[model samples]
Target chain A: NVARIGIGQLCSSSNLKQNLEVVKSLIKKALDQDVKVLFFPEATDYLSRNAEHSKKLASQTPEFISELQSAICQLTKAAGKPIDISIGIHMPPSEVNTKNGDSRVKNVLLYINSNGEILQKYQKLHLFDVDVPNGPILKESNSVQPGSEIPSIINTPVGKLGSCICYDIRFPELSLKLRSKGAQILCFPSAFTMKTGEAHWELLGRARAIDTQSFVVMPAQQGEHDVYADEVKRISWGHSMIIDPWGRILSAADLTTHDPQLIIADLDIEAQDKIRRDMPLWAQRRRDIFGDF
Target chain B: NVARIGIGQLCSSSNLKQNLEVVKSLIKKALDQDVKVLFFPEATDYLSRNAEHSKKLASQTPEFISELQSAICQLTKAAGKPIDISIGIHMPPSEVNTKNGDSRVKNVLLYINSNGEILQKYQKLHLFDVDVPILKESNSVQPGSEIPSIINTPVGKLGSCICYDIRFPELSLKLRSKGAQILCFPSAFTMKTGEAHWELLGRARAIDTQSFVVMPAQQGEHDVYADEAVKRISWGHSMIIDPWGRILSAADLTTHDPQLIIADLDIEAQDKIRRDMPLWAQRRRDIFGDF
Candidate 1:
């Protein structure tokens, strides 16, 4: 009747191997809980203190997936069940990066099947460039090239999934477009700043879920990461959560933990369908005014 | 530093004159507080027992304006300050409605100047065709055609919308792109969906648009007339929210009676927040190639 989904929260460091180990442990926790799929936060490969160093450790998809596939097989074999994964990693900027006047890395989110094969890849289109006066001012554009296209929805164990990154959630058009494409679940893997997270994260997540009539799975980064040099202390507000189609929080990550945490919850696909039918907002949407955004 | 805005909760019925009195009383309360603008809920003219009777009493723009103008003159004369009004009223359906297989009246929201001149009119675009197992709205409602232009209001550039329009953020985003500083949603939402969605969706629009969201809603159950056999209930948790997603004022639905809720909306602070955060500028226009 329901599919159990897992969300992993962690304080990822610049060290690629260390971050991978933390994610592997999260996978172990997910497998123990009989999770059908697990989602890990953005910058899982490495989240460095500075943009320069972050670019230096940009993950090569081939090598990273090689180790990730082994971890998935190991975890799946131990649990006697296959578990799909959705995770984020930084990649070298595309060939058109300079043309964009941004020669920075690409923030990528990948969907890997339970059999350890890549299913889909979504590069984050919205780069965080918030300059709130006296607030957390982060310019992600300084080191990240924005994606060119809206992502396509793909089949996942929980349901049909649409991929988006942290800052991308602010734009409701992206999510609605995915919903129009028959997405049953929307994933927003984030490394949100503590300030904005507390202000807007859960609100946006719940809003998106209710608007789209789909389950919202958000895996997030938590706490402060290790900094080798005198770099800014990158702190993340850790409230990774799974929201039902009715905008109810089914499972939530422990915000207090500096250590890695895994939260799992059952996603009721039938309930999603029922709610969509009960409140016919999807069909009732006035497409002419907005032109099917 | 702030402009006082008032939102009125009403339980309108088939009695057109009685509904006007209810709104007039709300105007008195709003003026007493010196609100710059006072908003009233949808079906301000009347909520009939059936669609047949509703079309019979659908507001005539001229007569309704004259009546409202008389009240504005009285209130302004008493308060010595102008008070703008934003409200919803049903209108005659378009001539082409029969062609579309729907001949129901139009659910329209209007903005009137303090001098009592109607500034802009927005017809409800999204008709509630909800076939909720227990409730059905499609039986009485007809969708309105899309209005291309946003209107100018006292506080900021306003985008006029009705109840069902809140579900579509695309419209809000489009209005914001057109330099909308405040979004108005005058509603007579049903209790079923209102309980589930009212606050969350309203708050989300405020945050997403980074603009003041003024929503005045119908409250409690509409009166059952002596000649009428059936009655309907409205979900009235009407609220006024700031750009920061803060609820400045919300109607107390437990009153089970008509009332006015007033709050001072700080337009300066709203402008400051937009300048500070600048989500509009940060939006990726090139990616999808359109707003």
Candidate 2:
């Protein structure tokens, strides 16, 4: 059976309420379109100007979570059907005061069901910490703590969904491991910088799809953020996409636009299974050489 | 220092001598352009019709190897400079009759120096054994058991792989881990898969590894049988990509004629990219473990 999934692309600002409103509107749009599940980009809560501000915003995520849960509950009740969401947010450290007073936040992805319950939460494994030549020099590790454990694949309306964050898409091993653990659909909710995203975003997405022979859904943040702030503005390359097992891009957002948009695609579980049967990459893998992941 | 490299694309049929002549001509073209090393696509020696014919043809590879060695030596002598080549060929099984009569050939890549010496030989680890309808490489080819060691070349520390091995990132990552600066994937890709993935895979490998990617690919159609009724067409577009994933030079996909694509690899610029990004160092080995 095919399940329709929606990918929401939006630019997040420092204002939490404004960001929440944007997400709510996208969720409503998805519901209207009869999308069983919708995915939102990383840092959907707020895109902070600095590390200190990011930690501060993360501390206020509890209220944000509560509001989103209520919104999902009310929206699904009105629709008379289950509506699931896979969204990214930052979490404040469990211990505010560490031995070294670690103030880093955890970048997490949450899968919320129609009943407003958090089904699964995945902490981002990789942190962006690169000094691009003639481009943005981001040090994500300065603010975000790297997730140690790989997230479990969860059962959802849209097949078996595997959760990963922006930078996690760069690592093929994680995707392979997820697929090996029985993930039919892989989601990489990203807020990628314009420089790296232009070069690698779609390329990596398509490659992962080919690698695992599974559906790849990427929800992304777009346009410029913190433009009026004293700090340098952070711009994201949006172009959110849904790629098939054959490495074909089924649907993609308009690259020319900075506006919030929704792209929908149906996950063909049977077709994906057929592809796996035809290629049998998993069965053909040289486990004797590399060992099991 | 910048090293100029050449990639040769050509269609190979069952005619071994004809294929050799095409490769030799391409070598001359590369030498004329002052290319330090030239790379050739997989199955450069010959493309046989069936598994039985493939093994029969592989038994004749020693003569093919000898001829190539002599050609390289003479070519370098005439040019009065060092010229190296990385070419793919098939090798007959060491033991013809196994416990079950395993009559398979080894799909191998050879790094031959200007001195007419084979410096390194790498058997392809991943065989192209997919059901693109009926093409199954594993039926005829024996997969290499171990990963080959990266070889020293004029271009960089070269990592050798062939065709289907490019799909698996682990091989490239393992090579990168072993201090390889350039990764070479000599492919004879099917038109079906190549149309969708060839270029994308090449660019992705370059970006992810932050290493120069050199791909020499087979192009156009080759006669599968003696009558030439059956044909196996290859997707060309042979490419050389920089460490930043920018395609340096590429061959035209439509052409059946042999062509050589050359590009100067700016090792200094590549080093700078690696320094700036430092992805290898940044990789969370503590979490995912070594690739």
Candidate 3:
């Protein structure tokens, strides 16, 4: 019945020492504000093993997992409050990549908690395919193994939040089905490309929240990270924004710069019930008689 | 097929000599044109015997009738032709009025031919209502007597003639119902009324004879011998104008003169064509379709 949930994005580096330090800094900042329920970043760069180095790094995955759990439990106990944390991490293998440069990353988001446990794993089903007709086409499906199973909506301390991946928001039906199964908030961790993100990123992100009338917390990848020291491209449009059911872009931060910021908003689900009662248009729908012809 | 017809109008005073002279002049004129059948003016001026001055100047109506018949017969023999003479006489008696220095008369028209036959008698049902409406709020419709019956054609004579009957449309419909082969003009009219209704209202009357029309007019008028008679008017557009259908040439009189207008036309072609269209054949009473 009672829950306090807070969200943050940690752009951890491949160095475990540096990544663990970055995580503690953010958790420390959150604890200072008495934020008990904390959400962790996706594709944690601490154990961020790309295709070639994954087999060798799989042995150290257990160590990385325990380190993150112990850190969260230690933070909660240090603050003298039973805190819960859900951290989303990813592990890539060689089979996940292809001959193409952009075809490399795996599509998986994870969830762990303050109880020192990795509780849930959600794989993204859809892959982004960007192309201009009769021109160069980039296909993400060739590299990414799509997830056929729907993500389970679980209880957070405060409210129910649904997990979604990048490239899923364009299909409105998916969000509608999730909402039908009783989801009030949605979380999507995106690494969107600069080309599409500039044009329709903010617009569509807000549109989905408004249409579904749910709060959307999007934690996006920020800053350009090169692949292999031999020089390769990994660019993202890094505008992490939280949109409300009323489609208010509460805050946005372009995280490509050195000093990227976090967005925060407070939404009362009770306000949602009041608004629905005030505007009863949904109850008065008569689609069959009016436009059947 | 070999019939000839002539129509003449007369306005007779209380003088028998002058009236007889008028008749003689008309017959003489008709004879010159080989008018084998002649229709005299309405009310041969002998319908009444109440005039004290004519009590000695003329015989009673029995003697007057015989004299008139003898005069027409003798004139026919003298002209060396079989002439049929008919008297168009009328006087539906009511209270006669000549006070107020003016006398109003009730006159009717009769269509009679030279065969000594009184073919039809009709009274003017329009009692000059416009005048009465100005004086009173509404006109008086209390006529002293009813008009005579219309003479029917032999189912289809291809020709017809009658007088001013009860109402204009009623007169037209009666003639049409009788299978009137054609209609002839019949009226003793006034300039005051005729000028307004002659051409414009003639359009309505024109539609009446849409199949075979034959209307010959009596063109002139006269003043009565009574001192109260200021002016008895019958100004003339005495057009032998063909009605709406099978338009025959109309005859118009010359200016300011007693004139005899003539229209020589055939009714045979019109009758034959009307047999084909038979507008009367297609009338629908249920639908009440417009003619």
Candidate 4:
């Protein structure tokens, strides 16, 4: 089966119609190239659903859910073979009674299938703690409950897909566990905060792939996002990439593709098999000793 | 048997007569303590007996061997406690090479009984490879061979010691391996070389002991052998410590008498059991693991 998975990302704001329009345009472009699967950047629809700047749309969760569902169903039905839509959506992200700082929970990267049904969802773990030499530690846990269980990796046409959101890249264990649980193609759907994305984002991703020998496709919001009113301006490292198992970046975007930075590469399992057979570090992993740690 | 052991050190040269006189004084001092046994330091009666500077009286192996036999007999007859004499007079310390930088064989301490008969002997391990931090590394390769295999601890005295003998932990380990508990490190040990590491080794020995640690070290220098050319100074932390391992008095030699560091330690074999942490339990031992 030809696995034409399309990853569509955008930098947008609160208007539900506007976010939907951006995703539809990319889905159309992807379908033109026979793409059967679509992935959007984190928190896909309803900035009103985001609830921090105001709670006027706090009551709109049911509406947002229905609308997004209908849209996925229509798109997958029209595409015929089976359309899998991974929509990053935010819902009431603010924790109750937390008054200080950006107490926003960026969670629920819902997977919508050909039947227009939502599947596995994962919440971002690290609440950025202290902005360091690398970047501002986004205090995420202040609002969102850090993800406890990583859902099982789902089998797809291309390979086994494992998922994670922003701020989770620094830790190598999640990906390692995902790989152990049989995930081949991994995704990091995040909106990288300015300082962190620039310093560690790229190096960390590359090291992860090299160490675990996995193809990581990171589709990120490709421009400035959630700009605060304070004197500080937030910039996102918008280079979304698809790297190969042999430690090569096949496709990458230049910072923000103010003009649709879109690129795709063939993810080959044969190459992955060859590398695993050569080194096989996963098989020799001394979990018994490391488990005590 | 109240074995009264008497010992004083003489850094000798080829002048066998002067060496003989120093031994007589040391015997007098020990006999003053009513000591019956006397021990001489490494190269005790012959500092580099084979060195070129020393003239006539230096004897070859056969003659030197018998001469040492005579000295032991003399001390035995005088003290009359069936005196035993230990000397630095063996061929090579089978457990350790005496040289710092090279693996050359050197004679070490020997043990003799009242009849001028040679008995037990100890070869000194741990050769100091002084760096430019103190001294430069000369082209030499001498480390004590293995653990001291032949050396046994005297039953009453509880120490297997020779001079310049603090370099190898195995020197103490050999005594510990046998029933010897206390260690007496006596001699002309240098001050510049090992002020810190030496004390630490001494404390380690006491820490290993079950009851007592009698470490009576040499005080101040007897530069009688330097003769204006060599300025060799010795570390004088003459200590007689306890199993609780307290150095009752400090190791300062400015006082008139030998610094007798005495203590009354209430020790039992149960003390080893009750307070034993046995740091060597799968203890990630790196250097001193086996021997």
Error of 1 at B56 (Å): 62
Cα displacement (Å) at residue A77, model 3: 1.2
- Which portions of model 3 miss their true places by more than 4 Å? A1-5, A10-12, A40-42, A46-62, A92-106, A129-135, A226-231, A254-257, A260-262, A276-293, B1-291
Candidate 3 residue B89 Cα shift, in angstroms, is 99
Candidate 4 global lDDT: 0.56
What is the TM-score of candidate 4? 0.44
Candidate 2 positional error at A259, Å: 2.0
Report the alpha-carbon TM-score of model 1 versus the true structure. 0.48
Report the C-alpha lDDT of model 1 over B1-291, residue by residue, as the tens digit.
247788888888777777788888888888888777788888888878777777677745346656876576546544555678888888775657667776577777878765455667787887656455655455666676675366665566888888888999999988898888888888877888889998898999999999989988888878747223586888889899999999998887567678888887788888899999999899888885676
lDDT of 4 by residue, B1-291 (tens): 342343453445534455556665665566556554555555454443222332222334335656556554444434443445555542532333334433344445566654454545454555555765664212221334434333232335355565456555556655655545456565556686557656666666666643344444444544345432544445656554555556644445556333223233334542573257443343344865654
How close is every model to the real structure, measured as TM-score? 0.48, 0.49, 0.42, 0.44
Q: Can you tell me the CAPRI class of model 4?
A: incorrect
The best candidate in terms of lDDT = 2
Better of 2 and 4 by TM-score: 2
Q: Categorize the docking of model 2.
A: incorrect
**lDDT of each residue in A1-293, candidate 2, tens digit only:** 45899998999888777888889999999989999999999999888877888887887786797688767767776776778899999888764235467778988999877756566779898876889899888887877888888988899877988889988898899999999999999999998878888899999999999999989999999899853332357998888999999999999998787878899998778899899999898999899999998
Better of 1 and 2 by TM-score: 2
Instruction: Give the per-residue lDDT digits (tens) of candidate 1, residues A222-286.
Output: 88877553236788887999999889999887766678888888887887888888888878877
What are the per-model numbers of colliding residue pairs? 0, 0, 15, 29
